Amino acid sequence: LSIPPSIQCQTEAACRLITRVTGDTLRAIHLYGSAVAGGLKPNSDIDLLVTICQPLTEAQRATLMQELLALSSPPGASAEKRALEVTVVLYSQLVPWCFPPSREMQFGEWLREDICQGIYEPAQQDWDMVLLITQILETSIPLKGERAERLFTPAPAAQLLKALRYPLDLWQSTADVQGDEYHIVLTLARIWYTLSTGRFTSKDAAADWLLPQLPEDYAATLRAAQREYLGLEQQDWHILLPAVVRFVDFAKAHIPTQFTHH
Ligand SMILES: CN[C@@H]1[C@H](O[C@H]2[C@H](O[C@H]3[C@H](O)[C@@H](O)[C@H](NC(=N)N)[C@@H](O)[C@@H]3NC(=N)N)O[C@@H](C)[C@]2(O)C=O)O[C@@H](CO)[C@H](O)[C@H]1O
Ligand SMILES: Nc1ncnc2c1ncn2[C@@H]1O[C@H](COP(=O)(O)OP(=O)(O)OP(=O)(O)O)[C@@H](O)[C@H]1O
Ligand SMILES: [Cl-]
Ligand SMILES: [Mg+2]
Ligand SMILES: [Mg+2]
């Protein structure tokens, strides 16, 4: 797998920073997500997983958070300077697996306001870490350390199922989805795709896979979500919000409850 030339400079800067702060504790840095698996759009972020051996000191946490702010920009602000998402995890949480796994920290542009004031999310449980590692074992590039298949072990299918279906419970009310309308719709398409095929695919490809299988009313909602993500039309998602809720409820009712495996 290859790093897109148009992100190499920023990725190299992020790696030099991570190396400085972590240093002796650093086990690996893996690039994953659309930059590697495909689907890198103008607003897409650069997804990075940092594996360390010991927890981050609050000095390391503060420094890494602050200095990442200078290497990252909000999505869409710049074609050259993309949004960074850096997730840090203890190796001991993955080998052997701890369920749910915990993450030491997660930098992201949606936290810029808080990070600009010394407010850092602490370590916490995150079922999504099961999905991250699973996707990394399939499609990732080691910027530092060993390839993923030599560092991590796959999770049991039983736990991958729980991680895939866990977000379905977070989305129940209008406010649970308000603000992330098309992101949630496309993510549901990816969850549906993975549970039915055992594979991971891009947001765009998951929507195309799902559209023919939906009643037209729900296909229209998925189409509007896909259309916005691709930059072809911005919708008024306050108007579409009742239809988004109906789409979420349809997915929760129809997504498989067991693998049709990875
Ligand atoms: C970790 N990736 C970022 C994060 O994504 C999250 C995103 O999570 C969002 C929930 O759906 C939404 O209901 C939730 N909204 C509520 N009313 N509770 C958001 O707060 C939540 N975002 C968050 N905690 N950062 O949906 C999940 C499927 C996700 O992709 C997990 O990995 O947050 C998204 C923005 O919310 C960013 O666009 C992503 O880059
Ligand atoms: N079935 C799934 N397939 C892929 N990702 C999933 C799935 N279910 C949940 N997710 C989560 O959704 C998030 C997607 O991250 P992200 O928004 O960076 O997507 P991406 O593929 O990098 O596309 P983009 O170019 O928009 O960044 C991840 O945190 C991932 O764990
Ligand atoms: Cl329904
Ligand atoms: Mg991404
Ligand atoms: Mg991301």
Residue numbers in the entry: 3 to 262, 267 to 268
Task: Give sentences copied directly from the paper behind this entry.
Aminoglycoside (3″)(9) adenylyltransferase AadA from Salmonella enterica belongs to the ANT(3″)-Ia family and catalyzes the magnesium-dependent O-adenylation of streptomycin and spectinomycin at positions 3″ and 9, respectively. Modification of streptomycin and spectinomycin by O-phosphorylation or O-nucleotidylation prevents the drugs from binding to their respective binding sites on the ribosome (for reviews, see Refs. 9 and 10). In the apo state, AadA has a monomeric two-domain structure with the active site located between an N-terminal adenylyltransferase domain and a C-terminal helical domain. We here present crystal structures of wild type (WT) AadA with ATP or ATP and streptomycin and of an active-site mutant in complex with ATP and streptomycin or dihydrostreptomycin.
Brief soaking of WT AadA–ATP crystals with streptomycin resulted in a 2.05-Å–resolution structure with clear density for ATP, magnesium, and the major part of streptomycin. The overall conformation of the enzyme is very similar to AadA–ATP (r.m.s.d. of 0.3 Å over 256 Cα atoms) and AadA(E87Q)–dhs (r.m.s.d. of 0.4 Å over 256 Cα atoms). Absence of electron density for part of the C ring (C2″, C3″, and the methylamine) suggests that this part of the substrate may move within the active site in connection with catalysis (further discussed below). It seems necessary for the substrate to move, possibly linked to a local conformational change of the enzyme active site, to allow the deprotonated 3″-hydroxyl to coordinate the magnesium ion before nucleophilic attack. The weak electron density for the reacting part of the substrate in the AadA–ATP–sry structure supports dynamics in this part of the substrate.
